[PDB]
Ligand SMILES: [Cl-]
């Protein structure tokens with residue numbers, strides 16, 4: 001029993017974190033096999049921030065202009081290249097702590113663990129979600145660039161996010177490990193702003209199913225809804241549309257609890273209309289949207305508390 | 307910027323988790339130096355659990371009755387003894403991944419990271435607080451016993467919790483690593499229950515400071531109060547008393563933000579008496595009490611390990 005924002009154990013990623021310095025700029029890199037990945041903006045200087053020409057900045061660098069430090073050991077850079085917004089530094093040593101890993105680009109609504117690091121050293125681990133507006137609501141200070149997000153289903157680390165910058169509203173933007181930004185953002189200090197965010201409806205429904213699994217039914221009702229009527233209502237509360245794909249993926253939780261997906265949709269409709277009337281759900285007075293259906297199955301019992 | 311419920315990096319502890327099996331029971335153990343620590347109830351049958359004599363149950367076990375597995379390697383047990391509610395299995399090999407560590411007993415209101423494990427394999431990490439009623443609001447399924455809680459300071463892991471049981475309300479009870487329970491709980495199947503809990507006032511104040519640091523200021527006001535007056539309000543709302551030591555500990559946050567502690571207490575008083583009026587603080591509609599002052603300073607300043 002219980003239900004917490006649960007991250008993956010971070011050790012497999014901790015063993016890959018290094019410090020990368022170019023000029024006066026230091027940030028974090030990810031050392032996998034004989035390659036260190038980091039944000040390409042490590043090669044910018046103060047004037048370069050608004051309209052950097054990264055190709056022109058990079059051609060002026062030699063391998064020895066990049067200082068890579070793994071704990072107390074300096075790694076020797078023997079090649080470099082840029083892929084989209086990431087720099088790849090080839091080093092002369094394969095990381096002996098490289099886990100089984102892959103790179104995955106995620107979709108809005110997906111969650112992942114973040115290992116926030118400074119100067120190549122881990123500070124802490126927490127769970128995030130890719131928001132519908134392609135930002136994440138992280139906790140990042142100056143020097144956290146190059147920190148990564150990941151999942152570890154089944155002993156293989158899937159790296160899905162590298163941190164690049166903070167937007168004016170205090171939320172965060174970054175890339176996949178191929179260097180492609182999530183959302184419309186660019187690694188320039190020109191004015192950029194997150195779009196209006198919305199609530200991840202499929203995740204709220206998953207969390208309501210988690211609440212039922214853990215023993216609470218107070219928010220259910222005798223009603224149902226069509227999918228289209230549900231979406232017409234939910235969008236009036238700035239909820240994302242629920243698709244048939246979302247209905248399908250909720251099937252297993254629906255089967256475990258005996259509550260049809262569209263019947264849970266009717267419960268959510270009523271919660272948006274009424275509030276909680278001084279109650280909580282899984283320790284929250286708000287509707288939580290950063291647990292996916294997969295996360296709920298990962299964390300909750302397979303036996304409903306009836 | 308941003309403020310998240312953040313756990314310590316768990317790598318130093320992951321390398322210490324093993325699987326312990328005795329009879330039909332499998333749970334988790336902590337392998338440090340040449341000793342594996344786990345809950346003593348591993349030796350019980352369900353019949354024994356009704357009313358166990360652990361002294362007598364342990365004399366009848368041999369070393370080979372304990373099957374200890376570190377990944378895919380069996381560790382050979384060469385001795386066994388009990389310390390309070392923890393079993394100590396001496397093994398023939400010192401864990402080469404043993405970090406610098408200490409065993410510490412924490413106080414209610416203090417927070418720590420839990421590494422939830424099953425079959426000796428780390429599964430997840432989250433942050434908890436020792437509640438005033440000496441339970442923790444964990445997330446644990448069958449097989450999680452022996453999972454541990456810890457804090458880190460630079461390179462030293464301070465182990466403070468080992469998981470033993472779930473109570474009927476779905477909260478959790480366990481021991482320090484010397485086998486002393488937190489709270490009035492016992493490792494037997496008898497009627498047990500969480501007591502009425504209270505809210506950790508000093509932590510709520512810390513989180514209000516975190517909110518101010520992150521730009522959430524709507525709850526600030528021109529008023530102040532006294533410790534005596536505020537504590538009469540705390541008692542009414544089932545909040546823990548605020549002591550002068552708590553005020554002293556929050557001093558750094560008061561200086562940084564320009565809001566004295568008793569000034570923030572006036573804000574908390576108003577929130578208790580009036581609610582949030584539909585607003586939120588750091589994305590919460592409840593007053594969060596599982597961040598300590600240290601946690602706020604650490605996260606807002608970027609300390610590493
Ligand atoms: Cl995805």
Ligand code: NA
Nearest residue numbers: 527529569572
């Ligand atoms: Na005030």
